[PDB]
Scaffold this motif. Sequence first.
Motif, short mmCIF file in Angstrom:
data_model
loop_
_atom_site.label_atom_id
_atom_site.label_comp_id
_atom_site.label_asym_id
_atom_site.label_seq_id
_atom_site.Cartn_x
_atom_site.Cartn_y
_atom_site.Cartn_z
N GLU A 68 8.16 12.88 -1.58
CA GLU A 68 8.40 11.79 -2.52
C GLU A 68 9.72 11.08 -2.23
O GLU A 68 9.78 9.85 -2.23
N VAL B 262 12.85 9.27 -0.61
CA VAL B 262 12.96 8.37 0.54
C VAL B 262 13.75 9.03 1.66
O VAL B 262 13.42 8.87 2.84
N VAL C 51 0.94 11.97 -0.34
CA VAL C 51 1.24 10.98 0.69
C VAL C 51 0.45 9.71 0.43
O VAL C 51 0.96 8.60 0.60
N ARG C 52 -0.80 9.85 -0.01
CA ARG C 52 -1.58 8.68 -0.39
C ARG C 52 -0.92 7.95 -1.55
O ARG C 52 -0.92 6.71 -1.60
N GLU D 210 2.30 7.88 -2.07
CA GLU D 210 3.46 7.20 -1.49
C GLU D 210 3.06 5.92 -0.77
O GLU D 210 3.78 4.92 -0.84
N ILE D 211 1.92 5.94 -0.07
CA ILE D 211 1.47 4.74 0.63
C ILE D 211 1.34 3.58 -0.35
O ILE D 211 1.72 2.44 -0.05
N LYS E 161 3.03 3.22 -3.19
CA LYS E 161 4.38 2.81 -3.57
C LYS E 161 5.06 2.05 -2.45
O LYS E 161 5.64 0.98 -2.68
N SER E 162 5.01 2.58 -1.23
CA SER E 162 5.65 1.90 -0.11
C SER E 162 5.02 0.54 0.13
O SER E 162 5.72 -0.44 0.40
N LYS E 163 3.69 0.45 0.03
CA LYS E 163 3.03 -0.84 0.13
C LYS E 163 3.51 -1.78 -0.96
O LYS E 163 3.84 -2.94 -0.70
N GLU E 164 3.58 -1.29 -2.20
CA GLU E 164 3.96 -2.14 -3.32
C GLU E 164 5.35 -2.71 -3.13
O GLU E 164 5.59 -3.89 -3.41
N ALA E 165 6.29 -1.89 -2.67
CA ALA E 165 7.64 -2.38 -2.42
C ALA E 165 7.63 -3.54 -1.43
O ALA E 165 8.40 -4.49 -1.56
N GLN E 166 6.76 -3.46 -0.42
CA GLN E 166 6.64 -4.56 0.53
C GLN E 166 6.14 -5.82 -0.17
O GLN E 166 6.62 -6.92 0.10
N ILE F 120 6.63 -6.64 -3.29
CA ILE F 120 7.76 -7.18 -4.04
C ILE F 120 8.67 -7.97 -3.12
O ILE F 120 9.10 -9.08 -3.44
#
Lengths: 493, 471, 600, 140
Positions: free
Chosen positions: A432, A434, A472-473, A475-476, A478-483, A485
């Motif tokens: 989780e 970073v 991990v899915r 996180e993907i 969340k990491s996608k969502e930050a992109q 934004i």
Amino acid sequence: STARPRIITSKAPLLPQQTTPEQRYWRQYTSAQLVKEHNSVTHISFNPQHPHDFAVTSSTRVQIFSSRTRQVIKTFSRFKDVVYSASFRSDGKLLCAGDATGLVSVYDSYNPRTILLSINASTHPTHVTKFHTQDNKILATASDDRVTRLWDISNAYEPQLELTGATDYVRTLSFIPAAPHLVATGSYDGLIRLYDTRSSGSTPIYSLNHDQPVENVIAVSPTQIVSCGGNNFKVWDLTSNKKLYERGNFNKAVTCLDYVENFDSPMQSALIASSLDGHVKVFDPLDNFQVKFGWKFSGPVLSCAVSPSTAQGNRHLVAGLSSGLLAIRTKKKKSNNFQRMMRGSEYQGDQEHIIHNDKVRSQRRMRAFERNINQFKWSEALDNAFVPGMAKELTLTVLQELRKRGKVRVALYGRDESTLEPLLNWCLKGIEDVRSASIVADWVAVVLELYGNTLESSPVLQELMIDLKTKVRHEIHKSKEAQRIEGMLQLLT
Amino acid sequence: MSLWQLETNSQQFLPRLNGIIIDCQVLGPQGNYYSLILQMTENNSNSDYQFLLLNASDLTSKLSINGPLPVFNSTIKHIQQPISAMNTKNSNSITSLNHSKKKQSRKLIKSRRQDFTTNVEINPINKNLYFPHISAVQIFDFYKNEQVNYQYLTSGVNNSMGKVRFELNLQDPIITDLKFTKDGQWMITYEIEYPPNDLLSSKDLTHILKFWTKNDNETNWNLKTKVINPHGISVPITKILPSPRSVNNSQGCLTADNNGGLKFWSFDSHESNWCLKKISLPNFNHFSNSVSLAWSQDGSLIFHGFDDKLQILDFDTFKKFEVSEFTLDSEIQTVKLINDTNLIVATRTTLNAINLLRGQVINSFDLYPFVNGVYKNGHMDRLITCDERTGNIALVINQQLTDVPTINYKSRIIIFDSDLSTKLGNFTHHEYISWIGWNYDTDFIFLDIESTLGVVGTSNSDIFAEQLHKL
Amino acid sequence: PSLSQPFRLATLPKIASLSNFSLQADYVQVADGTFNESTNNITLGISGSSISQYIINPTPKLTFDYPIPSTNIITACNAEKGQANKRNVEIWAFGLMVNKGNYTLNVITKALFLSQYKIKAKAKVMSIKIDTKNSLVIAILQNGLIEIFDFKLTLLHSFDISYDNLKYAKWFTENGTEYVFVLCPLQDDKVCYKLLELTSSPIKELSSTIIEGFSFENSKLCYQFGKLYKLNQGKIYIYSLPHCQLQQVIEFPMVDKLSPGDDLISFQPVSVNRVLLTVNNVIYLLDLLHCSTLSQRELTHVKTFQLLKSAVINSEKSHNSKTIAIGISTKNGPNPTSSLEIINIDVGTNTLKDSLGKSFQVVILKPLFDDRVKCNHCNEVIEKLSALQDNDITSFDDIFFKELKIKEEHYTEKDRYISDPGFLNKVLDLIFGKFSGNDYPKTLTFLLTHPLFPLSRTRNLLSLLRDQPRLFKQAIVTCPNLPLNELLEELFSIRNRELLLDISFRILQDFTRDSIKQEMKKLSKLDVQNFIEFITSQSTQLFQLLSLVLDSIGLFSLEGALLENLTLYIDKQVEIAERNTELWNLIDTLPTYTMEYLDI
Amino acid sequence: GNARVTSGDNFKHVTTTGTVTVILSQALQSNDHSLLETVLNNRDERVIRDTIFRLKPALAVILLERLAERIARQTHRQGPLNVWVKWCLIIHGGYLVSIPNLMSTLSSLHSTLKRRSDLLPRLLALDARLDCTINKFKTL
RNA sequence: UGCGAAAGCAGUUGAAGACAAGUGCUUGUCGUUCGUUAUAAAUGGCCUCGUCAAACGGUGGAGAGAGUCGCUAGGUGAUCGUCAGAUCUGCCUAGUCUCUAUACAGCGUGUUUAAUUGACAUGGGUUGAUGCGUA
């Protein structure tokens, strides 16, 4: 040869609002006691002398608290009507108080029975009674009569001087350091009036406009006076007679204000300001009076004070609440034959020609995991990482340290499902974060590439990876969502 | 180094020596001193021998002797790595030795890239000479011709343990660029940390930048701030240019990418740590390692030479001036201004003197015959150097051959006056000259692949007295 | 830096002495004390009219006037405000001639006439200084006598520099001390320089030097910040105090063309290393350090303009870059009228930024070495090409390639000698003039690949090559510094997919988004609407270009109906990208009792 | 030792009832974290849009900084707080455009968002590897 | 190996001689040569000088821990069950709320921008090693 370098703890790039040196100091006011008083505690003052006991005015009495015991040691209950001040003298011997009846009394501090001097300053309430800091013998009293009489202890029958010119209640009085003649009074008119007692007086030398009722005026320095009124506090300079700064961070109306200087904090000077919103916040005068710390209390705060600069003991922060609750926060501060036997240890070569010093300084003890790496115990170093009550940062280093050494597979050969689960458990959580996401990526990749066969025959390992796949899915997403934004945030610019 | 006690087969150790031990000896009538030879195998470009004389009493270095320790871009002459158990980057196996020797000779003779240029820096306050050794800085005093310090400026497995067998394949972080601010109180260092092999993250190099400080009396640099992955992720810091005295009294620097972004960092007293004061966007999809930065002495304007195009950017706006666009025939290797008026630009095929005042080229000299593909991008910058008072210098190295190329070289230095009107002096040396830079005095220092730092610049009593001394 | 329009202060009287426009400057004196950066007053002495004090702002107005008889010439004038025995007063000192027979020194004190005094001076009062702190008036005389007077003109001290015929005298303050230096002509173009310190004697001589090669008759002199500037024959000579050593000589070509006698020049300092120069009706603001013309202005409504004084900024210590200069402007016409004109001056920042590309001063490859180591005529060609007939391609190509010994039809590193811009520009001109229509020479293909293709010919270059696809493709790939505007317009106008991808890649490589994004705003909403529609119908450079569109369009312009279609297409593309990414990672990546048959 | 670590992306120095705008506007002005926390505790998306809709644009900017922090220190709050950030940009997009400087005042967002975005390529790589083995023993 | 960006784009890894092993033949090797730009594995891991306790000044923090059936948003189970729901006064995750020696990690306090002291004879001998504490 050279000494072995110490394993360097991993420090990720700084995040917003790191703990500041100012925040660290004020956070040490840990121990909190909450006392209940009869009525609103209006004024709180600290004795300028050791042991620096502080006096709280509540209802129709004054109570003095011991600094070390944090408990009542003296009570002044002679007063018939409500009380309005407990300021000490600079010498700390004498305590003065005001009454709604207007009578001002001076008592020997720590001797409630004896009453030195009693003055009937006015028929109206006398809210402020403060001793003059430079000159002991003179007392100033401000009353609802709107005249701030300047009494003398020796002559109590008539005021030495009577200052006037206030068109409303005067509830604030301050003496400017290094300028004994000058006296400053602030009324609810919104004007801060300055007077020259050396002259005839009774007419202010000049007025400073605040535009809101002035609840307290404090002379921060010989040339600067800070006045808190309405919903903000402003700092004025007399030589220029204009406001240098203003801060309106508060929500409710500021009531009390206190200043402490040259104390052992990183901030050389501090300005504590009650808010009446439950907030008392510390302002650093050296930095244009910016906020550096804040507390919250149950109800509106009517009085705040700190231990003087020369506390010589545990410091104290005192907050007064209209509900009557008093909040205290404290920063705590063989045989003679055998000595004639071995008497040379004390000596430090003060008389000797040559002094030779070769003892190596004692280094801090090394933890278990560091010892294993130094002794090349790769497999054990991984185990010491995954133990109960291990700091997460400290756990990240031994993982990075092994990877840096090029010993990742070597650390994972002699293992089965029984001793592999502690790693997977941590990886289930560390994925989780970073900072540890990338390191988790490497290690989980290896264990799969090294224990694929064992995975099939072991059920428990399978459920770990199913749960790991879910996280991990997660996180993907969340990491996608930050992109996403970042995509929108780019459009705005 | 292990002392085996043969009586009981026990042993004592002296670990964390500076390098692997080529040789050992017991030197004395009583074995008072141990003489050791160390190699420092980290530097594969050259063989770095260090002779150590240890007092057998307490195993403390009685005398450590070693010359300058540069790290050339490629191997030189007949340097061969030592013999190990397995063939690695820092070592040769049993079989690989002869084939490697033959391959090295073939590379030196046949190939055309023959770049041995080494980075070096000079400390303004002290005039010491700083060598960026792999993962460390060696501070060497050329006036006294002796080393003064050896400091590890990086993380990594450097002296924690002795790498053996597969561990020897590991690459420690490489200190690529090292520079000082003008006042000399700040040291800026750039690192590339290489991941270990056979991992998911085995292809993401980590770029690091660090700011160090020291008082003049002290001898060790203390790290003050650390930036991880500047300019983004996996984007190298191609060039670093410390700021001039006019801009923030020499407490600032510029960093420039292969994506042509510029980042202006400064030291803020309030924060007490360096901060990213200004930024330019490196977004264009044009990649080139050939970038050069020059800064006007006043500090108002900055010359950013990227690939074949040069930009004049205002410092205040940190953007194009409002001709700021100057196209060149080929990619620029170096941009400098000998004085505030003249700007000398060296491209891969020529060099040209420009008047900013006129925006016209004064002189153009042809470099293609001597420098065609010998040097990689950016190294002409360390081959070319300029004084701030008198003039600039060009350095040209030729492979000398008689009857197919030979190993031995011949180098030629040329002094040039500002705008290149005249050649104030012309000199030749008999060996390959790795670097030439301008000492802050009028003289210039240059380094040779033989590790040689040269400089180019403007009665009965009397008998009784003797006998008593004899006795 | 910039030059404001002059605005009128006053109209000079019609006096015979002022009729000589060449000598008109000598007859108008400007008080040093009242004219500086922060003062709003100007005290001016006009020969034969009066000494008048004017307020500049908000509007020019006369505040005081001291009448003078028409027969007198004001030699020196100075005014200063101070305290005298204490009442705040303004002290005025002025020296006049009546036919050279007698010399009048006058001191006037005014309350802020308190007193007026008059004495006969021995020689010409060349310049006057007032010291208000010490209540002194210091007058320098052309015969070399420096006489210190009180406000009542009682002589206190007299110093003789021993040399006569003084022509120039100027004060300057350094570290709080008052200093004065003088220039005394000698024979054979020799000059005595002296430096004097004002503090038993109040006057101390610090430096005394004789300077050779220093002429006065055609020289204009002014001082600023320890540097003396002498303009002569278009060359500005820079002398450094305290020794007045010649440091630099600056040639000014624009003054070299001036016929001697008809052109009237004025020269004053305005800031550090910056001077104001007039040539008839033209003002120049010059930076002497970088040798640049910061600003130029022409006063079309006046015949000439003469600087009298300028308020000088010490910009190293002053954040103000704005100052003023006062001058006399002469109108054109049969009855020319002279007036006092004030101009506002923006000096700038004194940094190289201002001086770039504004120098007032107006190539062949050279081997490194003139003379056993491993090696790793423009005019003639143009004339040969020029002499050819129109539309002859083969000979045109043959001459160009053969004479230059070019082997390839595209630029290579072996053609560096050809890089001279002058030769290339002419050949491009010949190609256009010689050839028009559908057929162009192969030299154009070579030049298009040339890295130094002139910027002047880049504009409209795509339009010329639209007709022939091959030339158009060649330009896109290698033509240097092609405009973004033309590229972007062709991007949304061309329907060919290969060209669209090619144009997109070139745009991104050579331009930044902030550069591209502004231009994409300019494009019409319909074209961008079509471009998006082509998308919904190497690709990443085409996609990433779309993101730039979606930025430039903004939030408001985008209409819902299309936005849905773009959503479904992108949602499909995102899914495919994730699908392919997984595939890429894929490519990189005993029983107790057993039954067997024995082999026998 | 005690040196400060940092990253290159830290551009710090370069309609319905039940709306909680009144509590929010006070909370942001006085930096009252506890009062702010109660406002953020609500999770009904309809309430979210109404609040930011009526919130003064000047106070919107400081809200983004506060939300950016709470995400950065607490990763688990990224989900629910992201809804606040998305609505702040949408509603006050016009005002945010017309601001002299954004990188200095929104540096916390760029820092937090950049860190999470950078992880995407690696996390995908593990997802492919995990999906491989997870498929393998499941079919077997 | 060449070029290039870090991504990658092209291209190689051959022949001879000799020795050993096994059976003239097969394989492996080379402190042997020519030409082209061109797994490992001999049980084999890094010293000593001084430790312990208590403070102080900076730099980081996922805070270190314990409660609150007080809320918010979720996921999910045992049994029965007329499928609407029941008991377990179900459980878990995350946030919020209360509290404490910031309780957690690290660098230093030989002079430094800042910041320390105290204890100990740093020895020899005997018992216990089924040690001691705990389930």
